[model samples]
Target: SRANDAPIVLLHGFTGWGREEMFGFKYWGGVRGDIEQWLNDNGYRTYTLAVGPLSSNWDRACEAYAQLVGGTVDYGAAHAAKHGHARFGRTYPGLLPELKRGGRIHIIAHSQGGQTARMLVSLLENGSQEEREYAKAHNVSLSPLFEGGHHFVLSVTTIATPHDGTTLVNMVDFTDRFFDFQKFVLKAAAVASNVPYTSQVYDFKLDQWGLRRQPGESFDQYFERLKRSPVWTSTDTARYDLSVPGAEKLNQWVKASPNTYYLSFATERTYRGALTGNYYPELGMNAFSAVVCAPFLGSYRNATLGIDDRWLENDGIVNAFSMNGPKRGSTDRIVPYDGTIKKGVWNDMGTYNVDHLEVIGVDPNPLFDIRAFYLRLAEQLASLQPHHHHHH
Candidate 1:
């Protein structure tokens, strides 16, 4: 084992790396503009991989392919020499050394990167009953893990991840197809705050199985009806299960994987929190208001209302409970459904109190000191490593 091998890999969230200032993007100050340098400076070997940002729908993990590692297929001339050639030598290895050496590899993921990580881990820890449930639930047809073992990293750190489906998906815009229910979800999502609207992006296209758009309905008009529906008005949270066609399946699949360390961290800086008066509560207001006005949409029992009932407590974007996991309450209380939280891994720190951003390395805001924050994480990771004694 390389005595000083405290290697850590960084994976950016959707539309991350090159694109910023869109959809919950957080600027990491005093850090490398790219991934490689950040790890190098921190005295650990690092690799930064690239993956698609917003493909819509969780099933297709754009990250499973090794082609996107470091923006260039395979390493530059220098890397090829040290790690052997790309395909047969490195990219196609049985497993990474961190696994053989430390018996575990550490991964730090953000947003969509979390999905990529899940896809990777499922590939690594294949054949678990949980994996099948995860696949069936999320419509995961296949994953890279089916091919081989991918043992790497002992723990995972996720910042504002959509491990579970986002209630905010309802916010997308789909005005183009007013009559199609699915398109309405897409249309409303387009004008959503922080999320950039690219015409090509839409969820229905991702599924080849031919799922219909449900019916013709505008997002605004549909949401108005959904809010007032009998579902949300009832205090029982269980009433709202699998409202969206694919949600329940997605939830099951997200829960699949080996029991390694998982950490979910976020802030109560957004609309639905106990501290603030819920600035963006208006985002969900449409859904609730629509519920109140449901009868107006028409007398159809399953009348097509476009708004997704999933979101009630959300950051202008993600449902707080799903993003942080179930342990997190409507007011941003961290909980286990957020996933099994490790003791020392989570700390609010009260800095970087912005929308959808977390304590990523160096803090650009004064509310929280990002540098000290990551250093603490680094120290904690060091302590968790099997060879912690040798590294010191």
Candidate 2:
């Protein structure tokens, strides 16, 4: 089953879907075409992972590891107890058991999935401190995901992911105050539609879900208190991790692997105004995203954070700058995709002239060929030599 190539795993972003054809819609490639099938047709082994739409990066990472490693989902007893969810979820034998037996994989993720990928690798290399402590206290087996290693991953290519977090999540929270009723109705509809309550809007805030808690309070007690808040939910944990500050904090522990190739694609939809010499940064967003992100992006720039010109440009959902890669401290280091691609550093694939949805080939642009784009990417990845795994 080697097939002479490493298998490609497609990880979708926020509110994204996988494998299952929900409502007859394929989430990864959308109407542009089925990306997984297209890649397979072109002689590449592909698997799309269906993770929690709005779960914390830690939870989603745990799920991904369980699925990829071919085992049952174990969110850890403490995480499950604190979040008020079952410790186990849907499980799978993973993709190509024999082919992947040697432990090698290439990941291509979009938006929140990028953050999920980073957290996954970080956990693989360094087990979580909280998790280890919890297991010891609870007298349970430690899940293998937190053990940390380079044995399974080869490369990770993120498409329009907010590596440095985006301000759009902030905008949504701001609108909720004025439209609380509308928010409630929306939540009701989301729930009725079978969306997990923990994956709802109130739980997606950076301040709310950043994983910080009061001193001396156990995670169980802390989450219990957080649940009383207007926005807290069971499955929440990632909004802050995708916030600017949240991203910074998460980066402190989720370092890039020296044996994995890191590539990213940044996007922008807004353009500069030639007449006013000021920015009109919402050009890249579609009508719907513009209505939601425009005023907030402006307000976020002018009021809080006091960001500069670069922060104004966005693809309607995520700022163009944040999509480049992780920001270590003050410096936002982006790798140049010129001659050679290497492991550890993020090699930016340049910004695209499309909107956030366009990166994944969504509707309104029926003819946009995202399939071709991914083909070229896979080809490039296929040409590179797999990293030599270092022995511990």
Candidate 3:
């Protein structure tokens, strides 16, 4: 069904791992099977990119770009100083160097990967003005990624992404986020330890803050090191980005490119009767996994942001409404995909009843076929106008 054969890049979200991590566990299809290999075997050229699992979208995007195009991960001198991390990290041999030759790649990002994907495309197309200014002052050579105007992306697809930010994160206190941070760390660490054959497969990928797992480091020791890392206090991290305030600040920078196609898949695992005041997680639909937070999200209400019952619907991790497109601090337009494909504006793919993990085929629901959903999405992306026909 693919016409141009532009590689489909699969980017994992917060706490996500590539095929290498979890000892062959696929983030795109955890427990179920490998979606990336399946896609490639079935004719869709796909690549699963592994970025910083808990890094900020900016950092993750930089790493993602380096891994995708091949180069030292230059996080930019300006950004590095501001966030207090090294200006450079690991280097890659390049996954799709053809992107430089006018080759386009379609991005399918889930969870926070959506924001990271958005940031990557925006950086490629526009670069960073602050980085350019700082480089000139310091007389330093800036990375090509910071030079802007590449426009090498064909489309961006987000599934259950918190484009407008999740209220669950917003509800918590900002400066005093011990619970949020600790909970994430403990949960992620548990996942890392419980999995079989994790000694060599799983990685935290926190090289910028200099906290890579030691050669023989046990999970507990490595987790302790991560807790002590400067990333905790740093403004740049998944902890902050997942928050509404941080997400709004991020939304101000990344923009929807008019040259690229945008699509979003939303999910809702909670429901309420017409007269019912509270939304409850449906049985077996992220019910046990999101037990602690689902209720809060369902009944949460804040008068200041104008949050009401409509904000109650969510797919375990992110609010259902925000999945359509970025709205709070962005000017990108969003429209329903009624058979006609459009570029720039978000093409809302409508909402599904699956939970966050379910939508990605992890602990998936039987009603919705995750494999078919992705196949259709890839076909739709493939159906776009060929790269040779640039309007400009």
Candidate 4:
């Protein structure tokens, strides 16, 4: 059946991998198999499915997104069921026959895999238009590569996906990180080669079967039992829902799926939004443009906090409004030097010269284009596939 059509699952960010170090020399670590060999050298059949623990813990990375759709994972019983609260489903019940085989199998998630594809489309629809026609007629439950409809998912194409989440966890949760003699000479060359210190800041490892299935739970004691697991974490985005819509009721809390096409990409630098503006600059204007709001932590002197999740405006780790998508009180009403685009919810294409590791593919920057962003997202998913069956 069209060779069992069901593949397009990239997901990586928050320490990224598939492999591509460069100066240290890895290569092919993350570009989702060179965007699946440039969508099969432009013919575009498709089947990427990268999904590994690859940098770890979004509930043990949804166990490689439940083994890319076949299912069966433990990830230390899903990180010991997050200290027994247990809400981690982040979609992929085996993809429910590839979304009932309707055809929208594209999902280009990055950075908290765009908060695990909007909490797997809010755990398969439930805000209702009859749970959006029962999620266009089901197929993302346990998997079959979806087809009940929205399957060619041309865009969710987030190249910095923090979706209204960062302050770099308050600069690594108030960093006095005192690089303890450079974390004791790189934790003694990562413990004489067993490697760690977070594998030199994320090349991988430290899920060692979710710390030997919690029997001794170290990675700083299973990340402090998921930072004191009362669950709902975005390390405190003023108490989370993990951004999809909010900043004083924008889209009025999630209902979306007019066939899942999203494009939220971003970058904002206004001397750290003019020392966190507390209202006046009217959205990152950095006091009437000191040359497009300069100072994203320049003058590195005594840079205290760096990463535990006050989520900074990052490129070395991931902040910029957490790679731009869901902090709209109108994302500071536009301006990467006035190209203008701040209404939010996809298609701005402004402020992208590159950085945040050259928009996620490790910057060589041939316009850092990911195949002209999948040929303009496969011509906007072939002009929304016949109006997605005339909106069902």
Q: Pick the candidate with the highest lDDT.
A: 3
Off by over 4 Å in 1: 1-6, 18-39, 56-104, 127-144, 147-149, 172-247, 271-278, 281-315, 326-352, 357-364, 386-392
Is 3 or 4 the stronger prediction by lDDT?
3
Top candidate when judged by TM-score against the true structure: 3
Summarize candidate 4's per-residue lDDT along 1-392 as a digit string, tens digits.
Answer: 02223345566544343333212321222332255567667655554333433222334334444644445543333233334433233344564345445544556665556655643453343322333344456522322211122233434556666565433333343222211211222232232222223333322333332322144332444344444434323322212322322222422443235445565565433233456532111222222122211232222222242222234344433345445455433332222323322221354444453444334443344545666765565444344332332232
Alpha carbon lDDT at 166, candidate 3: 79
Off by over 4 Å in 2: 1-4, 81-85, 172-236, 274-285, 302-306, 328-333, 366-368, 387-392
What C-alpha lDDT, on a 0 to 100 scale, does residue 366 get in candidate 2?
A: 43
Write out the backbone clash pairs for model 3.
Answer: none
lDDT of each model, Cα atoms only? 0.39, 0.66, 0.79, 0.39
Candidate scoring better on lDDT of 2 and 3:
3
Question: 121-146 in candidate 1: lDDT tens per residue?
Answer: 65455524543455567674443434
Ranking by TM-score: 3, 2, 1, 4
TM-score of candidate 2 to 2 decimals:
0.78
